[PDB]
Design a binder for this molecule. Structure first.
Ligand SMILES: NC(=O)c1ccc[n+]([C@@H]2O[C@H](COP(=O)([O-])OP(=O)(O)OC[C@H]3O[C@@H](n4cnc5c(N)ncnc54)[C@H](OP(=O)(O)O)[C@@H]3O)[C@@H](O)[C@H]2O)c1
Ligand SMILES: NC(=O)c1ccc[n+]([C@@H]2O[C@H](COP(=O)([O-])OP(=O)(O)OC[C@H]3O[C@@H](n4cnc5c(N)ncnc54)[C@H](OP(=O)(O)O)[C@@H]3O)[C@@H](O)[C@H]2O)c1
Lengths: 449, 449
């Protein structure tokens, strides 16, 4: 049960797996996703119970969506041997595994993340060792167990998926340093560790999705989408909506649309502070309300919130560090802010990203494509989600984001990529470079002219 | 000036630089390359004198080629703002700077590497802080100085390029940890510290280019290309040819082609050992002969080598660890080995990559594309250079490799990329994801069928 034994088992498995063809890894990869789809109800109930956060019905939808969207995305992708011919540059591209993947998986998505990481790794003839969050180790282990059971029935090499029980940080550090490539999906601490391991690493960053509602947009649809995303899994998703940046001239109209769709809006300064003092203790999120219901938060705050309320919306004191409510809230609570111009809406969003979450996701609800493009152009984000719930940032059958459970945050979030992690990031792509003799020696004028 | 003050001045510069348009960074980038082109003769002379390695004429050609090939490649690349529209996936792509680049530069390419890194950085609206090798600090600083003079003439903001005047230790470590993104072009130690800094890094592993001469190929042309690559800058290029894996049935022919083209071939065991004991001390390369002439090496070995000899070729005792000569040699010396079958030739090259240089470059000289494709599929290399000097792996006007002075070695070499570093690796590419309404919710059979 030592790390060095797990690494050694993984190398032996990887060599066996490296002999697989494209079609043969595709069989295993499809089965890994389908077992999470087929057992979504059992996994979802186990996750909610063990991690003490989230919503059963949303984790069922998450398992259904992630497994099917990832497989549908990667089923026709060429990741074995020669994958591309490019005669115009006299190049031939070859896909080769990176080897053994070390993957640290979060408490918020303890089922789909080992599944996603395993599917991406095995798709490129890599093997993987999962190290789960301690508060989710059982359901993560159970996911690995049922994945390994389907691999055995298909004749897969033993131990292409392993999992460590003890989250001993001496053993977790040793695992990242001993593996060929590291995936860290979790908090800022586990991400910095991956990028200090001396090995090529793919991490994530804390989210803090800012949302601009543009003037004249259908506020009813905007409110429905923002509420759908904020309340999903009790708000623990990294892409979840965190703020409502609304136009001053239509502010009451926007709030009314949220109220019409299940929000409880708090304007009174003293009543907001009752929530604020509950959600944050000494500037840090109160772990007791992470992924909890609206009513749990209301009772701890001592505020009566109507039955049926889907999200709480709190009027904020101001953008950025003017209000701790502008930090990431892993619960169904939004902070509302006003703007006079779209430029001010962007600056408010940017101030909150500088506070927390730079490089992740933003949402926008607008019929003004020039404003959308300006926001995409200037905001410190990897993903801008337009006119849909921001939780679709990780993939949906109605947008073009690459399906994943590991959302890169770029240099802002101190990650290596500013995009969703896929199979592509776990294979080396070699180049065979031929000689093009029918090419002349360009002169000084041709180069510098 | 302290690193903390360098980082601050750089961040101020980048904010001013972020407002630049595509055309405005292009003017700066071009002038950076052209000032190294126009001063190639002066820089080459200073580099040979200060670093006490290399060849003046080769450094002039290096400066001329790298500067012109990089500009010619990146002149028309879109790296600012919205760079691509993909309506089939309802996506729009946005290029954004990563911020402040920390770039450590090597003793072997002290002029072109600061140039190439600065061009790639500023092309994506980044700023850069160069940490040169101590044995090349003067000429690297001189390169930065003349580059900054061309920037000022064009009206660029102050300090978009800076250089650390001090060497390593806490300063270089603090720089890599404090910057947004790190480039490490150098030895295994600098690559390791880059991937341990807690920041996204790009490294370059040690090279050890294995070369297979295939049966029936024009051995005269192969010898000319291999000698050209091996002798360039006295053998200090990381892509430089290091071995001659030749068919046993034609071995004397191949050697004869080498001798005909300026090689001195040593078959006698005791005479080879005179060279071997000079080139390697205790299994490590003798730093006194790094980038030195054939005659300096011959004099130290006490072996008479004819005047005009271009390279020395030593018959190796065997593949891999059977001979220290199979390691990387940063000097104009090759190790010769025999093979009975092409499959065995690949195995020999494989064993030498396991000894040193896995993930870098190989060369092959062949008209049999099946053999070329087999070698490129089996070998742990990011680049396979066909029928040309292996030193063209960093780019040439006659192949498709992206021009660079920073050649990543993939996961094999403990790097994040298995390709040549370009502007692309220094921008965050973001995605605007619109909502596609026409798509319908897929059924189970439509997902898993
Ligand atoms: N971008 C994405 O794709 C994505 C996916 C999931 C979550 N996230 C983000 O990550 C955060 C959630 O991560 P989490 O929900 O896993 O909780 P967490 O934020 O990782 O914090 C977990 C707590 O337990 C510690 N901890 C974490 N992993 C541990 C381990 N293996 N062994 C021992 N202690 C450990 C952490 O300390 P350290 O500081 O030492 O970790 C921290 O105190 C949210 O901010 C969310 O937005 C992002
Ligand atoms: N793939 C590429 O694009 C590329 C480009 C250039 C060079 N290379 C590879 O790099 C190797 C040569 O690199 P080099 O010629 O620059 O010498 P080096 O091997 O990078 O370092 C040489 C010696 O200098 C020491 N050193 C002391 N202070 C240093 C400092 N401030 N920065 C760096 N090293 C310092 C190093 O210690 P540490 O152990 O702490 O480094 C090492 O012992 C060759 O193997 C070559 O193939 C690859």
């Amino acid at each position: 049960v030592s790390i060095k034994e797990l690494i050694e088992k993984a190398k032996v498995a990887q060599k066996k797996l490296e002999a697989y063809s494209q079609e043969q890894v595709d069989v295993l990869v499809k089965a890994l996703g389908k077992v999470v789809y087929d057992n979504a109800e059992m996994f979802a109930k186990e996750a909610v119970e063990e991690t003490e956060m989230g919503v059963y019905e949303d984790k069922v939808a998450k398992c259904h969506l992630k497994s099917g969207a990832i497989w549908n995305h990667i089923k026709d992708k060429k990741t074995v041997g020669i994958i591309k011919e490019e005669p115009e540059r006299a190049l031939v591209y070859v896909a080769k595994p990176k080897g053994v993947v070390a993957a640290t998986t979060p408490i918020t998505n303890p089922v789909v993340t080992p599944m996603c990481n395993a599917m991406a790794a095995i798709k490129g003839r890599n093997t993987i060792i999962v190290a789960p969050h301690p508060k989710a180790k059982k359901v993560s282990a159970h996911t690995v167990e049922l994945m390994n059971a389907e691999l055995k029935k298909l004749g897969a090499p033993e131990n292409i998926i392993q999992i460590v029980e003890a989250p001993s940080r001496e053993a977790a550090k040793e695992l990242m340093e001993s593996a060929d490539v590291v995936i860290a999906t979790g908090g800022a601490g586990r991400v910095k560790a991956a990028y200090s391991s001396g090995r090529p690493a793919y991490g994530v960053g804390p989210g803090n999705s800012q949302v601009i509602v543009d003037k004249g947009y259908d506020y009813n649809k905007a409110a429905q989408d923002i509420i759908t995303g904020r309340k999903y899994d009790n708000g623990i998703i990294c892409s979840s909506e965190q703020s409502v940046i609304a136009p001053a001239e239509d502010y009451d109209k926007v709030i009314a649309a949220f109220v019409e769709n299940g929000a409880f809006y708090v304007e009174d300064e003293e009543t907001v502070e009752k929530f604020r003092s509950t959600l944050f203790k000494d500037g840090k999120i109160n772990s007791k309300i992470i992924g909890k219901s609206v009513q749990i938060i209301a009772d701890l705050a001592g505020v009566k919130v109507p039955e049926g309320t889907k999200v709480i919306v709190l009027k904020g004191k101001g953008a950025g560090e003017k209000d701790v409510l502008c930090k990431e809230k892993m619960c169904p609570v939004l902070v509302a802010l006003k703007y006079d111009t779209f430029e001010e809406a962007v600056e408010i969003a940017m101030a909150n990203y500088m506070y927390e979450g730079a490089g992740h996701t933003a949402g926008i609800h607008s019929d003004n494509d020039e404003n959308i493009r300006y926001a995409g152009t200037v905001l410190p984000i990897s993903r801008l989600v337009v006119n849909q719930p921001a939780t679709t940032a990780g993939g949906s059958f109605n947008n073009g984001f690459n399906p994943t459970t590991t959302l890169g945050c770029g240099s802002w979030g101190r990650n290596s990529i500013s995009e969703n992690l896929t199979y592509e990031h776990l294979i080396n792509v070699s180049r065979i470079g031929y000689f093009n003799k029918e090419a002349k020696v360009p002169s000084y004028e041709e180069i510098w002219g």
